[PDB]
């Protein structure tokens, strides 16, 4: 997994690759690692898949309920506080590593959370097995006061460093831009640099190829 | 302390009666009448919707006939809300039995469990009983077609035809008058509609004020089928039997 | 039967006498208070009455600092008032801890109201015979005034008053706003807002005040504080030189 | 030792043109000793199909569990659960045992009764959802299955064609795994009907 | 382990169970009946950990009997085995699981067909023509995979068992002191007292 | 200490009545009127914002609440009881449904949940029933649009249109006259506004009225873009402005 | 009045009384008489044991709590058992944990606090028994009177029970006299028996009817009954 | 991690590096180890980031509620809360905290809570892996009642050395000045302190 | 109707809690006790009715200390007073344990405050039958407090409760006026002894025993200590003299 977050003059953007794996085998060539905690608070997670997914939905649920109760927009710091206290409680057994970003009544925010519950703040961040490949890129091109388009490029580039250079990451690049004034825009497969080439042959089988022993209709209607 | 405001809902009257049960039953007596008639080829459940309006959505409505299992259904008489609480726990018991024995729960077994829950609120806890009476209509490979009835007390019994709610004494007499062992579903359907028609506290017996259901073993199949008649279906069968 | 007047259950008319009587208790201290909104602040005035000479005047108050930003004034007995205050403080601290930002005035009000609504439905807990007025300059809503009662009811005001002579103060304020056509005191300094507050407090109650007859609390961006005998005296002198 | 390798077994699912297919083997052994040649791993609740590979006792327990949940769902909802929804039910049901999981690898297959769209999904033992458009694999011969599928697969196959493909994928993978095989059953699913065929394969 | 065999013929189910009970270096008893009758037409054989074995068996026996009296009806073999599986399946994930494997053989009076169920301590259930627990299975499955026919009579079944028991006495390292055989058919459960030389 | 009220506060009287449920209904009868009309492509629920002082800000007091993005509720009776009910409802929508199936609950079920909560306050030890009646309007993919009424007893029924509170009888009658199974959402909104005018003594405008609808999806109220399947909430509260505009065509 | 405010201890009457507590006290009076008096070296308990029939025993009224402490009971026996036992634990605890003998003054505080609990919470009932505690600790001889109300007092001497008013006046007189019976046990005892008889009327203190207990400087709390007290009748 | 708190004539100063590592990898190079528990009571965190952050968060909670009820808390009290948490949960914590606060009566105060959960009040305190390397230096160069400028130098030099030898330390040197004047944030970049 | 005075947490139609008021009666019926705040500490004194000559003199102590700097005295049901102190003692230990510093008088006041107020919320508990005067010296001054069964409490210059609260209060008010600069620890100790003597007239029938204690930043180093021997006699006389 390779996920990054980059702040820009009027908001923040987060990106992530789309490869999922069991050991050395690629289970999903295009899954979505970008999660919505609330309309304008998105999360990118790496680590134990099921964990980043569950933790993400739980806090998202509570944030929504909290929003309805307070009649206010969710704040990134709240998703951050809830996430960490939950993760800490579990002494790192819930292997979720996330980069949470978003805009709320108080500005644009970028944070990272580790399975043990410690949190970081910064203008650019990366997590995952592709963490270092990406960070190398970010540490080379990031500058202060990036334009939305520059941020998208920087982020998109960082995730690429991961795809190409890390075996744990690959396939496509997903992005999500959150700008202080507009709606958050999710960009599923904003880049698809790994389309499988056309197969040298077709393996469609001549009907009757497979030997059958018995057959029957199945009852679906009750 | 609080002992001052405690109604002691689970005590005996000097006559050895349970006040609350008796009063709960009294409550049940003003509920729309429900009838269950068991024939040789099926069971029939008919109920009268207490209070209705032009604006009431009868299509999406249900206040008397609930499906518990695929082979068991019930007719309600009393507090709908109370009934739903018991209905749901009843539905769970059915599923546990299934998950445990990989066999559908025998009708009486389910009925006893639910009745036991009721009896509980009768002997301990200091809470009011459920203001509900059920007519259970089910089928199982041990007793086939069965009809049962349970009330606030937690007592339950089996019948060939039975009524609960308002004017049961009248309805029972009428039923005891035209019921015949060899009956047939279609016969029972008619007997049921007639009975309600003669005990209603309303002007006429229209479809919009009814709920109808039958549990047959559709010859062209070999398994049990529960049918909960839709407004249109009720309106038809209503005319046919000659009540237009 | 007649016990529907001792515990929180419905009377045949659908009323809850215990809640109604709880309301009665809120006037037991015979104190009046009012809150108004500045341009960027919120002020609360409350009569301070110290009968006994043996009392340490500095310990007699019905105004509380709930949090760095929230101030709450109570109308009702002091023991219930302190009970409500401690809970409000506790509630505000935990909110910040769990959610990462200061509990908003309206939210603390809704929360406290909900708690009160419970004493309304569950028998064993008695309602608190107090009315709570919360104030602050919310980081999202600006100047705010929210009040709750033994009923569990709560709402936000452009300004408000509470106590025995609550009605005269209310109509007084209503009229001033029908006139000004705006929902607040168009003043830059809170000093003038406090003055306005104390002024209309006099006009409605038809009474003059000394520096030890009032109790003032002010809420500003990032801080809610109460005024001293002297801070008030200064305010009194100011309104003196206008009349 | 490894719960997911005591009994053995495999399950695979594919999407076609307005159709979905799901297949499994019939083996159930204990280590090297083969025991049952009739242990099927695909069950269905309404029009939604589920295949479970892994520890037999859990495969059974989960089926009984989901029968239970889907039954109640229908009584309340007054309609049968959809693939998408059921998948969510499976996911949350599994994660509910996050720290003492079921040693299973579930596969969901079905067609949305409303939108007629084909649907397949897979999860790990703690519930992480793997939603693929092409195929989902699971079992002791999962690597082989990934190999077969990745090569023999192509979009919009027709029922009679998807059948040939799925059967060849299962069959040939199962034959490179000591813990799978001993029979097999394939399910061809369409909006209106579902066909179930038993394949003839090596019995070693 | 101990020997636990089960074989379903045409109209019955036959259960063969070793008679030895060994602890350490000594064979404490040679006439042990590793079985319990759950109901008039359902028999269960068991093997495994020293204490858990009987405790479990008797526990299950009590429940079935209680069901029988409460409902005045005999649960079908299928139902009983489903009950037992669920028990073992609960046990496996408890503080101290029951380490017991069982064979449930019964005659379903409603279907008029014998049934054989194999369930291990993990709660793994399966219905078979013939089954066995322990190392025995390693010799008997292929033996029966060869000499078995569905239409066999109870008598052909007993000869089939004898063939198994002989193979086990020949190759198994342990002296299990012979077996006790029991037949479950439409007329209940009865024990073949003459297998020590049939 | 310790709630030593472990017995029911609602019991059966010799007549068969459950006094507290009755009284709770009496409490509802006194509440301000509220109603709901179902059109062929939407539902509308509305009530009166009976400001309890000209100094109070009526906005900081919504009688119409969103439970899920496709379900809204309104009431009549004791506001506080309603408030906590909405909280519990909003939560149960998650705990018992979204967190299990990944989708918001269909109207009937959520209503069923609320009803359950209320039923319990009718039997549990040491509590009084809820003094409110709710009108819940929503939309779900397999049941379309629906309107329900939930009573203190815990009973609930589906309606084509209905009213609760003060002048419910009068209003219910006015609805039976103007309703038909072909009404369009705007037609109902209109009819709604009319029926409500009869129950209002004073000012009748977009500031003294609270009206919300369950209609089409508002992708503009979603808060984000990029997911085709996510089209926006069907629940929308009408603005003071949007109301007045329809009042001039009254 | 009273009838409406005596249903349970948690209720205050309009005048500020706790009738249940008061009725409890009334059980003390109905109880047999007992007396306690101390010098500066000893402390004595003289209790009149009461009998049901002339075929029944004269129910023991003196309980030892520790080598250095003991008490006499007037009222509900069971309650005295409960309370004495509690005191026995407190004494025991003090020894085991601090290797310190429990101060008689402190034992009193413990008894008061324990009784007080049954007079402020719903459901419970006050203790229906009066206690007289005597003991020799690190500050000499001690005598305590324990009332179910929770009120415990330290005196030179006193009595409780029926007609207890006799002995109490007598001791309020004999004060200056016995308070100096230092170093002499038999005298303090005799001084006690002469106080207890000041509340007789029915009969005269027989042998199997008199009960005396003593503690002091070099006397571990001990109880004498029958022949042992014969020489005091 | 290299952290220290020094009390001087006008109050007290807290300094720290800005490096957090997971192995030899520097996860964050601009970390802020100087945490605020109260207006004029701050702390230096060392050890488990997760643990110290959680501990701090809870303390801040306690002092905020303490203030609501009893006004501003002493620096000694803040130390007692950290101590109470660290001591009571010693088996599951890996936190070394330095607590520094400015009182008007007590001026500047420094308390150090090492691993055990014991508390130590000192003129100044140093902690973190890097601290080992500057024990000699600090002992030799520390004087009581130094001036703000002097103290900022003492800390700046000490930490520059700690950062020099300890690979777990690095980045920038942050400081926090606590005096009656208020709170002042300071920062020093590599190019400056490296060549000291 | 009536009966609003039979259950503790009940509100009467005029918004009162009669059970609490009845508790006050029990207080007024008790011995008199007072508290005098001076320029650097506080003094406590209470009347001790000598029921008989059997009461070992100086033994049955009433004033209690909390921690090391708090002094507490109360009028009413003595057992209830001890109960409240036991709590306060824990309340104090708990505070010190977490914050290290010994509990501030105001903070301590609210602890007792909140706890007492608590006993007016449920009908399963009785309100406290005592009014308590307590105080001490802390980080910033001396503080004197009085707590009512209602849980209400305020800071005082002088305070008194019990049988002769009026005589006392009368005297106290004089002091407050004739000493706008502040009394002294030494002074207050005598003044207190006098006020107890005066206020003893409303009970002049029985003989009493005096008891005083004090906490002065200078005279006791901020610690609560009892007034004994010489200083006690000196104050006993100062009163005995002005009583004539």
UniProtKB/Swiss-Prot annotation, chain A:
Reactions catalysed: Cleavage of peptide bonds with very broad specificity
GO biological process: proteasomal ubiquitin-independent protein catabolic process; proteasome-mediated ubiquitin-dependent protein catabolic process
Top-level taxon of origin: Eukaryota
Pfam families for this protein: Pr_beta_C, Proteasome
Localization of this protein: Cytoplasm; Nucleus
Predominant localisation class: cytoplasm
Hydrolase among keywords: yes
Keywords annotated in UniProt: Cytoplasm, Hydrolase, Nucleus, Protease, Proteasome, Threonine protease, Zymogen
Keyword Nucleus: yes
Active site: 1 (nucleophile)
E.C. numbers: 3.4.25.1
GO CC term (a single one): nucleus
GO molecular function: endopeptidase activity; threonine-type endopeptidase activity
General function of this protein: The proteasome degrades poly-ubiquitinated proteins in the cytoplasm and in the nucleus. It is essential for the regulated turnover of proteins and for the removal of misfolded proteins. The proteasome is a multicatalytic proteinase complex that is characterized by its ability to cleave peptides with Arg, Phe, Tyr, Leu, and Glu adjacent to the leaving group at neutral or slightly basic pH. It has an ATP-dependent proteolytic activity.
Extra facts: The side chain of Thr-1 acts as a nucleophile, and the N-terminal amino group acts as a proton acceptor. Present with 11400 molecules/cell in log phase SD medium.
Protein family per UniProt: Belongs to the peptidase T1B family.
This protein's name: Proteasome subunit beta type-2
Natural source organism: Saccharomyces cerevisiae (strain ATCC 204508 / S288c)
Swiss-Prot record, chain B:
Top-level taxon: Eukaryota
One Pfam family of this chain: Proteasome
Cross-linked sites for Glycyl lysine isopeptide (Lys-Gly) (interchain with G-Cter in ubiquitin): 99, 198, 230
Compartments reported by the entry: Cytoplasm; Nucleus
Subunit description: The 26S proteasome consists of a 20S proteasome core and two 19S regulatory subunits. The 20S proteasome core is composed of 28 subunits that are arranged in four stacked rings, resulting in a barrel-shaped structure. The two end rings are each formed by seven alpha subunits, and the two central rings are each formed by seven beta subunits. The catalytic chamber with the active sites is on the inside of the barrel.
Function: The proteasome degrades poly-ubiquitinated proteins in the cytoplasm and in the nucleus. It is essential for the regulated turnover of proteins and for the removal of misfolded proteins. The proteasome is a multicatalytic proteinase complex that is characterized by its ability to cleave peptides with Arg, Phe, Tyr, Leu, and Glu adjacent to the leaving group at neutral or slightly basic pH. It has an ATP-dependent proteolytic activity.
GO cellular component, one term: nucleus
Keywords (A to Z) from UniProt: Cytoplasm, Isopeptide bond, Nucleus, Proteasome, Ubl conjugation
Gene3D superfamilies: Glutamine Phosphoribosylpyrophosphate, subunit 1, domain 1 (3.60.20.10)
Further information: Present with 17100 molecules/cell in log phase SD medium.
Record bears the keyword Ribosomal protein: no
Coarse class of the protein's main subcellular location: cytoplasm
Coiled coil segments of this chain: none
PROSITE patterns, A to Z: PROTEASOME_ALPHA_1 (PS00388), PROTEASOME_ALPHA_2 (PS51475)
Gene this protein is translated from: PRE9
Family the UniProt entry places it in: Belongs to the peptidase T1A family.
Protein's UniProt name: Proteasome subunit alpha type-3
UniProtKB/Swiss-Prot annotation, chain D:
Positions of crosslink type Glycyl lysine isopeptide (Lys-Gly) (interchain with G-Cter in ubiquitin): 69
UniProt xrefs under Pfam families: Proteasome
Location relative to the cell: Cytoplasm; Nucleus
GO cellular component, one term: proteasome complex
Record-linked InterPro entries: Ntn_hydrolases_N, Proteasome_beta_3, Proteasome_bsu_CS, Proteasome_sua/b, Proteasome_suB-type
CDD domains associated with the record: proteasome_beta_type_3 (cd03759)
Main location: cytoplasm
UniProt keywords, alphabetically: Cytoplasm, Isopeptide bond, Nucleus, Phosphoprotein, Proteasome, Ubl conjugation
GO molecular function, one term: endopeptidase activator activity
Taxonomy, superkingdom: Eukaryota
PANTHER family referenced in this protein's UniProt entry, alphabetically: METALLOPROTEASE TLDD, PROTEASOME SUBUNIT BETA TYPE-3
Protein name: Proteasome subunit beta type-3
Upper lineage: Eukaryota, Fungi, Dikarya, Ascomycota, Saccharomycotina
Curated annotation (Swiss-Prot), chain E:
SUPFAM superfamilies xrefs: N-terminal nucleophile aminohydrolases (Ntn hydrolases)
The keyword Nucleus appears for this protein: yes
GO biological process: proteasomal ubiquitin-independent protein catabolic process; proteasome-mediated ubiquitin-dependent protein catabolic process
Gene Ontology annotations for the cellular component aspect, listed alphabetically: cytosol; endoplasmic reticulum membrane; nucleus; proteasome complex; proteasome core complex, beta-subunit complex
Signal peptide: none
Sorted UniProt keywords: Acetylation, Cytoplasm, Nucleus, Phosphoprotein, Proteasome
Subcellular location: Cytoplasm; Nucleus
Molecular-function annotations in GO: endopeptidase activator activity
Family matches, as InterPro entries: Ntn_hydrolases_N, Proteasome_beta2, Proteasome_bsu_CS, Proteasome_sua/b, Proteasome_suB-type
Modified-residue entries (N-acetylmethionine), positions: 1
Coiled-coil stretches: none
Pfam family, one: Proteasome
Any further remark recorded for this protein: Present with 21800 molecules/cell in log phase SD medium.
Function: Non-catalytic component of the proteasome which degrades poly-ubiquitinated proteins in the cytoplasm and in the nucleus. It is essential for the regulated turnover of proteins and for the removal of misfolded proteins. The proteasome is a multicatalytic proteinase complex that is characterized by its ability to cleave peptides with Arg, Phe, Tyr, Leu, and Glu adjacent to the leaving group at neutral or slightly basic pH. It has an ATP-dependent proteolytic activity. This subunit has a chymotrypsin-like activity.
Similarity remark: Belongs to the peptidase T1B family.
Protein name (Swiss-Prot/TrEMBL): Proteasome subunit beta type-4
Phylogenetic lineage: Eukaryota, Fungi, Dikarya, Ascomycota, Saccharomycotina
